[PDB]
Write a protein that binds this ligand. Structure first.
Ligand SMILES: Nc1ncnc2c1ncn2[C@@H]1O[C@H](COP(=O)(O)OP(=O)(O)OP(=O)(O)O)[C@@H](O)[C@H]1O
Ligand SMILES: Nc1ncnc2c1ncn2[C@@H]1O[C@H](COP(=O)(O)OP(=O)(O)O)[C@@H](O)[C@H]1O
Lengths: 96, 848, 1010
């Protein structure tokens, strides 16, 4: 689900269809201002694409995995872009 | 401590062998008390040691089958010498392997005619080995000394007892080191004249552990009872065809317990045993439990039941009798006293056992005619001989079928029925039609025989033991010069007496000369080789997997260096698309007038098929090797197959992955030694690679080197038939053609300059048991086994006898039906019958 | 049979007059001519009576028959009698002839044996000729077959007997049944052991073909009985150890009680059977006795031991273990053990048991003899000759031909051959016996063989049958005429000899089977042949429809229909509903049901009953639907690899090889299509250039040698299809403006479209070698560039026609810029934009599916370069949806998304909102889970969806009704295969245009403006 979230920026059928129109309503006043002061009432399909982009800008995933656990090696092969999309900081064994 | 860890090493050989730590402490504690008391402190210590080693060996040796009795005392001898600085793990490792890892392509050439190619690689190993507490290799320049024109070295190899004599050039230096000297003298013998290692080890064990260990103990049942208490049962391990229940009752008669309770263990016998043992527990009396391995549930229960907590009378002794079983309860084996009653398996002893037991005075009186008694001997004689063939291994029988006493009884119970119908009818000899006899004794025994070529061997035994001349007094089977010469006659009894048969059997020699089984004097050398390879193959499975071998190289670092040396020697991976371009160029047979090319030609198709199979092997070897070098360094996780491959490579066996695939089908040729496997790979491939690249097919084909030799011959068979469709008269069909086979009988192989018109000219087939003299078959030379055959010329005859031997070519020395390729008419004209070669076990081997 | 007896006095009581053994619908009736069983009140006392009267009747019947057979012809005799007796009556005759013959040889009457052999051959000649008559019923077929299976064995022995006396051993060995007049009883001798025939009523039972091994096995089992030792035959599975013991019983006319031994059996369970055997005087073999637990066997051993002891002394009664009383022993008891060495079950038998049973090792029955019997059982003569030939071919052709899965040269195919070989023999008796077989071998195996192996087989065939010069094929003149006439109706179909041959072969297998399949690699034109054959059959008499489904695209449960977990009501299955509609005798519809997806063990097993001769589909709710004559089943499988060897042998497999419909034949097809579009001049010129590079020099074969490690592994035909697609797209501009071009200008196009279709998949190192190959063969290439300039950087412009460096459109800063959401025109995106623009602009044809899949390295800007292309879509004109695949994603998850996204409808057909021609992007296309079989379930739906433009609706209400999406386009991105990641299924590859995106050599052009 967090792999899916990271690549797409959205989840398919996450939230109720009526709940979209409430959320997107609040988003519109920032959107029209952010898009070089467009100041026209957006459609509900165009508004979605901004909101998705907005999500990815604000939503950071922090993954904390063990390299020795056998599952780790499998997870990379099994979930694309859970490794290749997020920056990897590796934690070396503690120096002197 | 050493000794106890030896007993754990024996646990790995067989589940039944394993003894608790708590049993060891009893031997060890007892050992200290029973030992001779010295005033001097060092003499007192010395005494305890010499006693302990024996007193524990004696104990364990009793719960050890005959085949492994010698392996255990060898493990013990190493274990002792590994603790001190006389032997490192590399030295033990050497003795077991002795340069079967090395491959002739990488190393030096042989350069000597009288040495075999294996013997030379075994030398070369000694040349590169430093042993322990020595600067440079002891046996460095040995290959120079043997390459020197000194008859001493030849003479030492050709001596019947090599180990007994001193080493021709090296003997002086070996005498100077006392502790290691015995071991390095053993590792020479292992290398050259491998067959005499069991006899060599006994000389080696003697210098390390003292004489007393080589002598046979042969525990009597009184000694077993005396050792045993009420709380500790006596477990008997039974090899198939052994029964010690009669021997307990014999001892019971002298202890006034003869009428004892006996309980044949099984399902629903747990309630019978409880009742019986509770009587024994209080009253007193012996309890013999037969076939316990079957009733496994009671064996966990009996451990706790026969424990000291329940009240046990001091007279009561429990006796368990059960054949070896995996997942036996450990708990019982840790309490019990282990004994192994195995058949003595000599010819004399085997005969003795039948006449003492299943033959009785009642039995030899059932028909009441001279011939019946005379036949009885023959069948019983035969029966014992047919067992002792199994010793010799694949030469003896392709597959070893345990011929029980049932087979003998039934074959005798048959003869009663037949002779009673002739007895009913009015030199006073019945008709006894021996054509009927042959078949029916070779039906009742035949019931076990699965192989077509083992059957025909048995049949032949029939035609040499059950002939019409056995009823006359002057017929003596085999008149052999065992000791001057023993007669091996049918004994003659004017009045039928069991005693006079038994009396005769006492005269029969203890050592069985191979001539009695129809085999050559060289048969025993093959027998000694197998039981020595068997010993070495058992002591290898025990060996620890510890990286610290000594000599400044780890186990993994030895495997690395061998995996890296293998990868460079491998041939380049064939490109499937390129091969098909090469194959489409290939000519056909009779390539001047043929004007046929491409995958359409029956041998070319076949070449492609075996080139794609070869690649598939190379590719698999290539893959695994690379991964092993990566796995040790820690670049990749160790897969289950890679661990198995590394372990195999260390101890110069071929990885099971390269021999057999997951499914179980055979992917590459079966050799035992990795080194010999890797020389074949580079030679098998070279022939395919010499043929495929070049336009012309090899003059002298190397039949061994193909994956499907049976397919290759059917290949050839097709070629000739296609040339002979115009010929007449008749039209040649694959239906109704067979192989026509001749031997070239040429002084040189290089006299052959052009291929034959129709045939193939196979080379490098080896005769087992026998040689080729150029006057057909001929008895082999002494101490020369697997004598080489000349160029064999195979064709198609198109279908359309006595003094023509129908020999089988086997793909391997293992000779099962699977590795049968094709039968070959060998003339065998002068003096010797074809039925006499079948008893000598003549065959053509591709492999060895 | 129960009859009304004692009606006048003591009525309602019933009398039994006749015994019935029923096989299928037919029965073998032995009436009790007297000895009527009056069935009294107590059941056990009348059941005893019954068993006595049956045994009394057979004795009386067989006593009359043994007198009849000598003074009556064999044809006349066998028909009159009952199966069991006819067998006995034949064996008696045979022995009495050999005895009589051998008696004359001892008295020195020369050629007395030869005279008897001539009568035995006449006997055999009649029985073989009685197979040919095809008498009604399963019983009467079994009766004649068992007789034939014996008679060959009689003829075989007696032919090569060679004995000068009756008392010579070789004759004694042979099983001998004789009627002794003196003691008035049937006696059966084997070696020295005489048993009296038990006269249990067997009826008509299948007998095993008697080998020389089996003749030597009987002996030992016999000797084993005479000595009172048990018998226990050990061998590998499939030898029929059980069967050979039963065979010996049925020989002696004694019932055999088979007990399927297992782990669950206890010593009490076993004890009951033995007590049963000793008290009844019946044989009782134990199937797979090794699979008894070793605990039990120790107990059983004492039980057998106690039985043995009693038998040896001739005790009338003995005490059994765990029995209080002494039980009656019948002398004629024999207990046997079918074991298995190299056990799949438990360890070898106990030390007590071994003694009690005499083993017989049984090897695999020699295949030749099995065939020989079968050929005789059909109605052939000179079986011994044929059988060897037939064997030699099959054994040899297995080891010489390529090891493919759809090849079967074991007994399954052999028996299948011999019943068709037989149905040929009956109709044309006068025809030579070799040629009939030789033909019947040929016509069946040919359709199966790959192109490479047909020359090898036609060699082997010639090599064993050199007498037969040439055999005429079934002409089929009706269909042969119609294919050329039919093919010319469509603009895009060429007619080759290889292809037309493969149609005929499909029609040959269509007539005889119901479940013919069609195997071949990707784009071998299986889908086409299907379509033609049907379009040919439509014009001759009855119309043929085809119904394409994908079995893998739906879950096994959902295809066949299962019981719903909620509300406990039955949901109709997809296949069941299609099957049901399809199976109705109304207006000669003859609809084929095809299963495009690959065959797996899972889904076919439910459908396994249809493929067999039963022809009834079971849903496992009790309901069983009967298959009508008109309806048929097909499979468009590629490989046929992951299917059991049993299910394959049922269906009739035609193999379409790459070389049948060559890429030449598709090209020439594509060029023919361009002439029917109204533009003949263009086509004429494109031909002269396409031929030059593709057929004259083998560019695809030369390219594949010189360039190594192609990132996606594609077939040659795929690469050519992609060429034609791209070439079409390029020239599509010149179609609208009706502009013919010069040979130079088309050549430039073709080499562009060649370079990207063929050489696309390749990586940067290989792109150079590919570009360096075009220079060596004098194709037009950009003459002047920089270092590491390639064909791939340039394209052929529509406005003015030459090679132009593709410079990406200059970036316009999109007002307020966040580096994260900023995507620029780059050299990679433009080339991607361009190729995508060619494939998706094209109108839907046979070659293209308006679908492009771009492979690449991880984060090589696949995802971005599509999203750049999928912007600048006029919202009214074109829509854009994106779904992301993942290892979790299943066919139902993907189906539900597309099903929701295009809900607008035009009659039957579905569409996106309004009429937008929505392009579905599928990022990470490789990711979905590959199962053990090696087939991606969701991707098979994707392929179904693209190819057919429809899948089957899975809502409970509507099942077996297609939903078709009139206008859709598909872009795929996936990380390129190798290194543990999934490859896309070959089948699917062909649908998509494929090209490899690469990491740029200078990102200066990308990040320089930012
Ligand atoms: N005889 C022919 N002449 C010209 N073109 C043909 C011919 N047969 C097939 N084609 C074309 O070649 C392509 C092959 O597709 P087809 O579906 O016939 O093969 P297929 O074996 O079903 O492929 P797949 O296994 O992928 O379903 C189609 O575009 C078809 O129109
Ligand atoms: N034209 C472009 N403008 C800006 N960024 C780009 C462009 N092309 C590629 N990239 C960057 O390269 C990376 C490539 O990954 P992406 O394009 O998302 O798909 P994939 O990772 O599947 O190739 C992206 O993170 C993107 O930021």
């Amino acid at each position: 689900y967090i792999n899916m979230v990271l690549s797409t920026g959205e989840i398919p059928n996450l939230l109720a269809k009526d709940e979209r129109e409430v959320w997107l309503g609040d988003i519109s006043q920032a959107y029209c201002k952010e898009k070089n002061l467009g100041n026209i009432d957006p459609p509900q399909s165009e508004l979605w694409t901004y909101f998705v982009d907005r999500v990815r800008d604000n939503f950071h995933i922090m993954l904390c995995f063990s390299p020795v656990g056998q599952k780790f090696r499998e997870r990379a092969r099994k979930f694309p872009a859970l490794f290749n999309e997020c920056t990897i900081d590796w934690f070396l064994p503690w120096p002197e | 401590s050493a000794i106890y860890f030896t007993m754990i090493e024996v646990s790995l050989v067989n589940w039944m062998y394993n003894s608790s730590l708590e049993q060891f402490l009893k031997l060890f504690i007892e050992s200290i008390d029973l030992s001779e008391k010295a005033q001097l402190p060092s003499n007192r210590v010395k005494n305890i040691i010499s006693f302990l080693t024996f007193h524990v060996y004696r104990y364990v040796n009793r719960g050890l089958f005959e085949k492994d009795k010698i392996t255990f005392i060898l493990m013990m001898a190493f274990k002792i010498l590994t603790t001190a600085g006389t032997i490192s793990s590399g030295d033990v490792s050497l003795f077991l392997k002795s340069g079967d890892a090395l491959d002739i392509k990488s190393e030096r050439q042989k350069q000597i005619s009288y040495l075999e190619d294996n013997q030379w690689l075994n030398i070369l190993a000694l040349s590169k080995h430093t042993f322990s507490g020595q600067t440079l290799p002891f046996f460095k320049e040995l290959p120079d000394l043997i390459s020197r024109s000194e008859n001493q070295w030849r003479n030492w190899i050709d001596k019947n007892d090599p180990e007994n004599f001193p080493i021709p050039d090296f003997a002086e230096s070996i005498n100077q080191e006392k502790e290691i000297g015995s071991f390095i003298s053993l590792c020479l013998v292992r290398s050259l004249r491998n067959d005499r290692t069991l006899i060599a080890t006994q000389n080696f064990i003697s210098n390390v552990l003292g004489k007393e260990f080589t002598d046979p103990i042969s525990y009597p049942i009184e000694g077993i009872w005396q050792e045993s208490s009420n709380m500790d049962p006596v477990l008997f391990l039974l090899s198939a065809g052994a029964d010690p229940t009669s021997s307990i009752d014999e001892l019971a008669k002298k202890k006034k317990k003869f009428p004892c309770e006996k309980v044949s263990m099984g399902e629903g016998q747990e309630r019978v045993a409880r009742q019986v043992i509770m009587k024994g527990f209080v009253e007193g009396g012996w309890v013999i439990l037969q076939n316990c391995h079957l009733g496994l549930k009671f064996m966990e229960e009996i451990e706790t039941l026969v424990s000291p907590i329940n009240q046990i009378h001091e007279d009561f002794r429990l006796w368990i009798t059960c054949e070896q079983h995996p997942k036996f309860p450990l708990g019982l084996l840790q309490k019990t006293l282990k004994v192994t009653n195995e058949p003595p398996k000599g010819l004399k002893a085997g005969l003795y056992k039948t006449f003492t037991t299943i033959i009785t005075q009642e039995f030899i009186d059932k028909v009441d005619h001279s011939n019946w008694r005379s036949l009885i001997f023959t069948i019983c004689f035969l029966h014992s001989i047919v067992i002792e063939r199994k010793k010799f291994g694949p030469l003896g029988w392709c597959v070893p079928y345990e011929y029980n006493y049932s087979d003998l009884e039934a074959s005798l119970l048959y003869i009663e029925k037949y002779l009673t119908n002739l007895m009913s009818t009015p030199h006073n000899l019945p008709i006894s039609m021996n054509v009927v006899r042959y078949m029916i004794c070779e039906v009742q025994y035949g019931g076990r025989i699965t192989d077509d070529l083992d059957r025909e061997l048995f049949i032949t035994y029939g035609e040499t033991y059950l002939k019409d001349g056995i009823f006359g007094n002057d017929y003596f089977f085999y008149d052999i010069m065992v000791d001057q010469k023993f007669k091996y006659r049918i004994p003659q009894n004017p009045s039928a007496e069991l005693i006079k048969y038994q009396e005769y059997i006492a005269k029969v020699p203890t050592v069985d000369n191979p001539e009695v089984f129809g085999l050559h004097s060289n048969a025993d050398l093959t027998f000694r080789l197998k039981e020595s390879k068997e010993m070495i193959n058992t002591v290898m499975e025990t060996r620890p997997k510890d990286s610290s071998v000594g000599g400044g190289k780890t186990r993994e670092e030895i495997v690395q260096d061998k995996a890296k040396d293998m990868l460079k020697n491998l041939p380049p991976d064939y490109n499937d698309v390129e091969v098909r371009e090469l194959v489409s160029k290939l000519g056909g047979p009779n390539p001047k007038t043929s004007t046929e090319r491409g995958m359409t030609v029956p041998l070319n198709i076949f070449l492609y098929q075996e080139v794609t199979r070869m690649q598939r092997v190379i590719g698999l070897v290539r893959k695994t090797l690379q991964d092993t070098i990566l796995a040790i360094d820690g670049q990749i996780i160790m897969t289950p197959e890679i661990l198995e491959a590394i372990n195999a490579i260390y101890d110069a066996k071929v990885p099971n992955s390269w021999l057999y695939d997951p499914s179980g089908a055979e992917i590459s040729w079966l050799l035992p030694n990795l080194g010999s496997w890797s020389t074949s790979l580079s030679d098998r491939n070279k022939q395919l690679n010499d043929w495929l690249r070049s336009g012309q097919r090899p003059i002298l084909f190397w039949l061994t080197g193909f994956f499907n030799p049976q397919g290759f011959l059917t290949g050839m068979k097709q070629e000739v038939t296609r040339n002979h469709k115009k010929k007449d008269g008749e039209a040649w069909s694959l239906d109704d053609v067979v192989y026509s086979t001749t031997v070239k009988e040429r002084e040189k192989e290089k006299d052959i300059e052009q291929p034959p018109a129709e045939g193939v000219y196979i080379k490098g087939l080896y005769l087992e048991g026998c040689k080729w003299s150029k006057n057909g078959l001929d008895d082999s030379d002494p101490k020369k086994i697997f004598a080489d055959l000349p160029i064999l010329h195979v064709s198609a005859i198109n279908k359309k006898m006595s003094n023509t031997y129908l020999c089988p070519v086997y793909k391997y020395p293992k000779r099962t039906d699977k590795y049968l390729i094709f039968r070959v008419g060998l003339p065998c004209e002068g003096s010797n019958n074809p039925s006499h070669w079948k008893l000598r076990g003549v065959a053509l081997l591709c492999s060895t | 049979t129960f009859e009304s007896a004692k009606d006048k006095k003591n009525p309602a009581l019933k009398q039994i007059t006749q015994i019935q053994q029923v096989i299928g619908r037919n029965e073998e009736n032995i009436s009790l001519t007297g000895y009527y069983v009056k069935c009294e009140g107590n059941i056990e006392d009348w059941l005893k009576k019954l068993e006595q009267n049956m045994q009394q009747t057979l004795k009386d019947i067989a006593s009359a028959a043994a007198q009849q057979v000598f003074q009556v012809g064999l044809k006349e005799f066998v028909s009159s009698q009952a199966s069991q007796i006819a067998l006995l009556g034949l064996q008696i005759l045979w022995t009495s002839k050999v005895n009589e013959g051998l008696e004359r040889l001892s008295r020195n009457e020369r050629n007395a044996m030869d005279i008897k052999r001539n009568e035995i051959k006449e006997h055999m000649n009649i029985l073989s000729s009685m197979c040919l008559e095809d008498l009604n019923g399963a019983v009467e077929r079994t009766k004649v077959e068992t007789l034939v299976t014996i008679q060959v064995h009689q003829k075989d022995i007696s032919m090569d007997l060679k004995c000068k006396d009756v008392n010579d051993f070789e004759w004694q060995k042979q099983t001998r049944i004789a009627w002794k007049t003196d003691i008035d009883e049937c006696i059966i001798s084997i070696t020295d052991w005489d048993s009296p025939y038990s006269y249990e009523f067997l009826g008509a039972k299948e007998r095993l073909c008697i080998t020389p091994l089996t003749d030597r096995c009987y002996i030992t089992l016999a000797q084993a009985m005479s000595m009172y030792y048990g018998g226990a035959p050990a061998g590998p599975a499939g030898t029929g150890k059980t069967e050979t013991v039963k065979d010996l019983g049925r020989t002696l006319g004694v019932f055999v009680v088979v007990t399927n031994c297992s782990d669950q059996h206890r010593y009490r369970d076993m004890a009951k059977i033995f007590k049963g055997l000793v008290q009844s005087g019946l044989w009782g073999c134990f199937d797979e006795f090794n699979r008894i637990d070793l605990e039990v066997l120790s107990v059983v051993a004492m039980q057998v031991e106690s039985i043995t002891t009693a038998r040896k002394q001739h005790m009338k009664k003995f005490m059994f273990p765990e029995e209080e009383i002494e039980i009656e022993l019948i002398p004629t008891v024999s207990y046997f053990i079918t074991m298995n060495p190299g056990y799949a079950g438990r360890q070898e038998l106990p030390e007590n048991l071994k003694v009690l049973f005499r083993g017989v090792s049984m090897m695999v029955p020699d295949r030749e003899i099995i065939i020989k019997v079968k050929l005789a059982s059909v109605g052939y003569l000179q079986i011994d000759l044929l059988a060897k030939k037939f064997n030699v071919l099959y054994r040899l052709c297995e080891e010489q031909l390529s090891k493919q899965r759809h090849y079967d040269f074991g007994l399954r195919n052999i028996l299948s051959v011999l019943r068709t070989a037989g149905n040929t023999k009956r109709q044309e008796i006068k025809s030579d016996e070799e040629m009939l077989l030789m033909r019947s071998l040929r016509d069946m195996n040919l359709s199966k063989l790959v192109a490479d192996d047909i020359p090898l087989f036609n060699g082997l065939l010639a090599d064993i049958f050199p007498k037969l010069k040439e055999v005429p094929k079934k002409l089929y003149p009706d269909v042969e005429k119609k294919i050329p006439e039919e093919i010319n109706a469509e603009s895009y179909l060429i007619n080759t000899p290889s292809f037309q041959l493969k149609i005929i072969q499909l029609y040959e297998t269509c007539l005889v089977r119901h479940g013919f399949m069609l195997v071949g690699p990707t784009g071998s034109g299986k889908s086409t042949i299907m379509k033609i054959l049907t379009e040919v059959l439509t014009k001759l008499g009855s119309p043929h429809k085809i119904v394409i489904m994908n079995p893998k695209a739906i879950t096994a449960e959902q295809m066949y229909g299962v019981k719903s977990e909620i509300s406990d009501d039955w949901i109709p299955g997809v296949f069941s509903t299609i099957w049901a509609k399809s199976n109705n005798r109304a207006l000669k519809h003859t609809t084929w049901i095809t299963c495009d997806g690959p065959v797996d063990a899972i889904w076919i097993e439910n459908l396994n009953t249809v493929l067999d001769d039963n022809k009834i589909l079971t849903l496992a709710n009790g309901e069983r639907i009967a298959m009508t004559e008109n309806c048929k089943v097909v499979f468009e499988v590629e490989n046929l690899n992951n299917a059991s060897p049993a299910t394959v042998s049922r269906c009739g497999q035609v193999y379409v090889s790459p070389t049948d419909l060559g890429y030449e034949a598709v090209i020439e097809g594509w060029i023919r299509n361009r002439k029917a579009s109204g533009r003949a001049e263009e086509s004429d010129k494109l031909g002269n250039i396409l031929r030059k590079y593709l057929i004259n020099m083998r560019f695809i074969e030369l390219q594949s040698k010189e360039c190594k490690e192609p990132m996606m592994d594609t077939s040659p035909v795929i690469s050519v299809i992609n060429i034609l697609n791209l070439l079409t797209g390029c020239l599509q501009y010149f179609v609208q403006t009706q502009r013919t071009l010069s040979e130079q200008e088309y050549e430039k196009f073709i080499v562009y479209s060649m370079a990207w279709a063929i050489g696309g998949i390749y990586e940067a190192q290989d792109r150079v070698r590919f570009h360096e190959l075009l220079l060596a063969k004098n194709a037009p290439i950009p003459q002047k560039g920089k270092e590491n300039e390639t064909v791939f950087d340039y394209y052929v412009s529509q406005d003015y026609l030459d090679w132009k460096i593709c410079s990406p459109e200059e970036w316009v800063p999109p007002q307020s810029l966040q580096f994260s959401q900023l995507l620029l025109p780059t050299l990679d995106s433009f080339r991607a934009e361009m190729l995508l623009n060619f494939i998706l602009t094209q109108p839907k044809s046979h070659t293209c599916s308006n679908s492009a899949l771009l492979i690449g390295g991880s984060g090589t800007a696949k995802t971005s370069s599509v999203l750049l292309y999928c912007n600048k879509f006029d919202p009214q004109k074109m829509l854009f949806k994106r779904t992301n695949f993942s290892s979790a994603t299943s066919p139902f998850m993907f189906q539900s998304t597309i099903e929701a996204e295009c809900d607008f409808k035009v009659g039957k057909e579905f569409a996106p909102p309004g009429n937008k021609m929505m392009t579905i992007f599928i990022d990470d296309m490789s990711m979905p889970f590959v199962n053990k079989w090696g087939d991606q379930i969701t991707l098979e739906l994707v392929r179904q969806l693209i190819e057919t433009g429809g899948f089957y609706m899975l809502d409970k209400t509507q099942r077996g009704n297609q939903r078709k999406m009139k206008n859709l386009q598909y872009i795929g991105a996936m990380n390129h295969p190798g290194g543990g990641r999934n490859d896309i299924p070959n089948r699917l590859k062909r649908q998509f245009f494929i090209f490899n995106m690469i990491l740029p050599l200078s990102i200066e052009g990308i990040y320089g403006p930012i």
